[PDB]
Structure 1
Amino acid sequence: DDKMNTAIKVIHTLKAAGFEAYIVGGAVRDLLLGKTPHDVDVASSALPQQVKVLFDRTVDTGIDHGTVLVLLDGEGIEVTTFRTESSYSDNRRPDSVEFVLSLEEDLRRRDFTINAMAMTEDLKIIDPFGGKEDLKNKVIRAVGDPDERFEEDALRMLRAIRFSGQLDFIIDMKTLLSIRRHARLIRFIAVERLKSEIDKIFVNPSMQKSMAYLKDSVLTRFLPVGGLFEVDWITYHTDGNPTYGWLYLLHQQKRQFTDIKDYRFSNEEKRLIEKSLELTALNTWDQWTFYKYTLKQLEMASRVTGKKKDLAAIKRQLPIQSRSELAVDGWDLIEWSGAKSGPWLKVWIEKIERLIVYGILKNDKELIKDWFEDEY
């Protein structure tokens, strides 16, 4: 609610210094759609060090690509010099970046017409490629020659799919046919960028339409384990967490986490998936189930099997929540047994823990001692 104002102030300051400056990218597209922008990018004739001269606080991490982050009025505004970029078939080499001297040299190499507009300080729209009419017709269309845009960055092919669902647009026919012809190029894209786009699709609207384009575009032929995305997505409803899309995909096909490990999940994400899948294969959940698994795993497993229980209340009403509340530890068992420390302690602590979680044995050291001396 303050980002557009701050971007306008940034533009005013750049122009006071004699430079050209415009709002570009998604913010123009969102403004024309009546949405509040997420991010507001500025394109300028200023070079990075000239931007830094004009603003007190700046972050420089993107300077090599022409970008300076300007910190103003509590917002961040990316300011990028007019530039073009090209990606090599080797995704180890940083992008080849070529500063250019005019706005339209920059705009004419962006991915889609609705993303290739600029807005002046006085709200005039610069639209050489017909983004306004594609926006009104709800069409995702590559700028210029679609083959060139997709050779410049193959991830754009998957971005088209993601935008279709995010905006409830269709993909321009000539553009879609170009994706089909170039879909093999997706193999050169870093898997982290692929996962980022797929995660967006999984939580965005009209995801079933996105997944149909994923197949129709022949991206599922060449994406890492891409055939696994061709499941029935009818009964998928996002919980806001993209991990649920991966879980859904795996559960629908009776597959395990190892089949999707090419996408380089965090250990935390991997655990949520694997533990949720275990729960879906567990025929009966009882107190020990609710104790040992996390509420988010219980909820995700329930969501994908179609159950609707009040999982939080069941877990909350166990006698204890976790091991740290147990009234006994291995050194109590060493004392009572007269035996030396060894792996046996873990076995006997778990026996006791189970009896406490089932509400059979009281979580009380002296009463546990009585039980242990009788049982051991």
Structure 2
Amino acid sequence: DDDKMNTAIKVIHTLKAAGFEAYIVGGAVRDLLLGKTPHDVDVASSALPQQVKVLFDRTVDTGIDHGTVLVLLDGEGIEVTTFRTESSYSDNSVEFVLSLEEDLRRRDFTINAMAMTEDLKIIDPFGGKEDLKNKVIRAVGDPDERFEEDALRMLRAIRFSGQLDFIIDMKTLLSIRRHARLIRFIAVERLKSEIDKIFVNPSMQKSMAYLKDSVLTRFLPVGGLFEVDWITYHTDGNPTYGWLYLLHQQKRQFTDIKDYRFSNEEKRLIEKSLELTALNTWDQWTFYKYTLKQLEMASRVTGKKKDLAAIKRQLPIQSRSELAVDGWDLIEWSGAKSGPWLKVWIEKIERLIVYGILKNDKELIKDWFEDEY
């Protein structure tokens, strides 16, 4: 941000004062050249991780095995990574290298394979500058090698196309088509992360067309389900809405996408939203029992535009904890022993309160109960 680049320049200055090479690398150079403000600024250096820690008071050591040290400075965090190459075996291997160019030549795409010196000189051995100008996502070097090194890069190409409103380089895209089957080796968590980004990024309809055209929908987990008409999809900023929109369009249920390992919270949002889309009429009990995010997501995917927040807000009560009676009141009044019957009767009372028929008052509920029971 307005401080991240400055902090990275300071980190670079410190590494070089100690005799090491250091550069801004990767997405920050791309964003800079695009006239955008970087979200992350990575620094590539000849320093090894323990030498970085010597030079900075506050570091975080999570990625040390991979050559990365997070430097905490001026209220920012700058990742400092030693010149390295990586490769993923088929069953889900880092080499430290001695030069910058050895690191750059194994990165995913030319626009991500540039470096910038402290003095703003761009190091661009693979023509990232021209691909950035032409709006092209092109694998560095031989696309076949880049995709065999990490098959997730094939999907990443799709994500970048939407994120940046770029096209995918023809030779690169043809290489994805030839290697699409390799996506089966990628951990589903990494696939869901990229797909979630696509679902909230611009030009997503173009991204989903590349998903099909690249042959990735042939081989992704339940990949054919992504081949829906996305024209009427508009992100609410929550990737979960993309999965809901995907299921609703095809009249399918959550079990069909469970391979992607949703959290219980995400799964609930999807399942409860889908229920609402199949519910013919919503009334006070609907608005009471479902969450506002569920009502809003169901409304969004079915086209409704009601003021859901106001309807839920104007219910007589918001939740069970406001109820003026509990099961032990019913035990007292009934003279019957505790049992599952209490839940049945508490809900009868709860409904009458939520519909504003019975007052949420213990004595009046007591009168009602003794009559009905």
TM-score, length-normalised on structure 2? 1.00
Following superposition, the deviation at residue 16 of structure 1 comes to 0.1
| Structure 1 residue 252 displacement after superposition | 0.1
Q: Is the partner of 1:62 in helix, strand or coil? A: helix
- Could you report, residue by residue, the CA deviation over 1:312-371 in whole angstroms, capped at 9, with x for unpaired residues? 000000000000000000000000000000000000000000000000000000000000
Percent identity reads 100
Choose the corresponding residue for 1:292, options 283, 289, 294. Answer: 289
Alignment partner of 1:277: what SS?
helix
CA distance in 2 between partners of 1:22 and 1:355 (Å): 68
Q: Deviations over 1:98-145 (max 9, x none)?
A: 000000000000000000000000000000000000000000000000
CA deviations on 1:32-79 (whole Å, 9 max, x unpaired) are 000000000000000000000000000001000000000000000000
> CA-to-partner distance for each residue in 1:253-276, whole Å, 9 max, x for gaps?
000000000000000000000000
In 1, the alpha carbon distance for the partners of 2:180 and 2:113 equals 23
Q: What residue number does 2:159 align with?
A: 162
Q: Which contiguous aligned blocks of 4+ residues in structure 1 show a shift greater than 4 angstroms?
A: none
SS at match of 1:220: helix
- 1:274 equivalenced with 2:271 (yes/no): yes
- State the alpha-carbon separation in 2 of the partners of residues 231 and 21 from structure 1: 46
The root-mean-square deviation of aligned C-alpha atoms, in Å, is 0.2
SS at match of 1:42: strand
Shift of 1:26: 0.2
- Once residues 282 and 100 of structure 2 are traced to their aligned partners in structure 1, the CA distance between those partners, rounded to angstroms, is 61
Q: Which runs of 5+ in 1 are unaligned?
A: none
1:339 aligns with 2:340: no
**Distance in 2 between residues matched to 1:254 and 1:206, nearest whole Å:** 24
Equivalences for residues 201-216 of structure 1 within 5 A: 201-216=198-213
- 1:32 is aligned to 33
Deviations 1:146-172, CA, capped at 9 Å, x for gaps: 000000000000000000000000000
TM-score where L is the length of structure 1: 0.99
Structure 2 residue ranges without an equivalent (≥5): none
- Alpha-carbon deviations, 1:292-326, whole Å to 9, x = none? 00000000000000000000000000000000000
User: Secondary structure of 2:241's partner?
Assistant: helix
What displacement does 1:180 show?
A: 0.1
Q: Kindly state the Cα deviation for residue 212 of structure 1 after the two structures are TM-superposed.
A: 0.1
Distance 2:26 2:337 in 1: 68
> Per the alignment, in what secondary structure is the counterpart of residue 71 of structure 1?
strand
SS of 1:231's partner is coil
Q: Secondary structure, in 3 states, of the residue corresponding to 2:70? A: strand
| Separation in structure 1 between the aligned mates of residue 18 and residue 6 of structure 2, nearest angstrom | 19
Distance, in Å, in 1 between the alignment partners of 2:28 and 2:164 is 14
> How far apart, in 2, do the equivalents of 1:371 and 1:85 lie?
71
